[PDB]
Design a protein around this ligand. Sequence first.
Ligand code: D57
Ligand code: MG
Ligand code: MG
Ligand code: MG
Ligand code: MG
Ligand code: MG
Ligand code: MG
Length: 210
Amino acid sequence: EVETFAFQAEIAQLMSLIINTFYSNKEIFLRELISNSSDALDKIRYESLTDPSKLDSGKELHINLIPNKQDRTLTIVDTGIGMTKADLINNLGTIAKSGTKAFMEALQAGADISMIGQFGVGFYSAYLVAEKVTVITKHNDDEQYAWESSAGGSFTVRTDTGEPMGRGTKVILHLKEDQTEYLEERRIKEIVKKHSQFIGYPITLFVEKE
Ligand SMILES: COC(=O)c1c(O)cc(O)c(C(=O)OC)c1CCc1nccn1Cc1ccccc1
Ligand SMILES: [Mg+2]
Ligand SMILES: [Mg+2]
Ligand SMILES: [Mg+2]
Ligand SMILES: [Mg+2]
Ligand SMILES: [Mg+2]
Ligand SMILES: [Mg+2]
């Protein structure tokens, strides 16, 4: 069973802006996704402060970056708090309608696209580099779900029967054919060093067989 939903008009507007605006500094997508992962890790950490059994689904708090040149995907995995089905439907746990408005008002007032994260909607910068994004997520006491969108005004949610994750979120970026530099080890390392060098969780960049 696959359910199909329409994006709210403001989010669809945001996504078509991101897809169609000429903007060369595309690398900021990775900073925004790692920062979102860090926020999700903070939240399961905080909750474990009073209920340590919330770490029963996995005690290790980390971020993995997995390039796959064969599939042309870059995947960002975290063991953060994850998302419920309701979270996914509510724009992946974001206040995206008010955030998009405040991002718009700021764009009109002398901001550039790189500030997107200050308005809570940094996730959508993924569409600077990805033609399709798949989000696999597992929250404690809910099932594992897969969210997906190639923009165009709609997204899908299904129960995920793939590899069970213990807890957390996997963002799978299906890269545009001209954006494969983000699969290169030295390029990913350069971006992480430039924009994410002080994140408070281990970031492991996986390598690939030649
Ligand atoms: C829309 O962002 C994400 O796609 C995203 C991510 O890339 C990595 C993640 O691990 C998570 C996650 O599962 O957060 C539970 C999300 C979705 C939630 C989210 N939306 C904006 C920021 N966040 C992270 C967050 C913020 C406040 C409290 C907890 C977590
Ligand atoms: Mg963030
Ligand atoms: Mg874990
Ligand atoms: Mg792989
Ligand atoms: Mg809102
Ligand atoms: Mg289903
Ligand atoms: Mg590494």
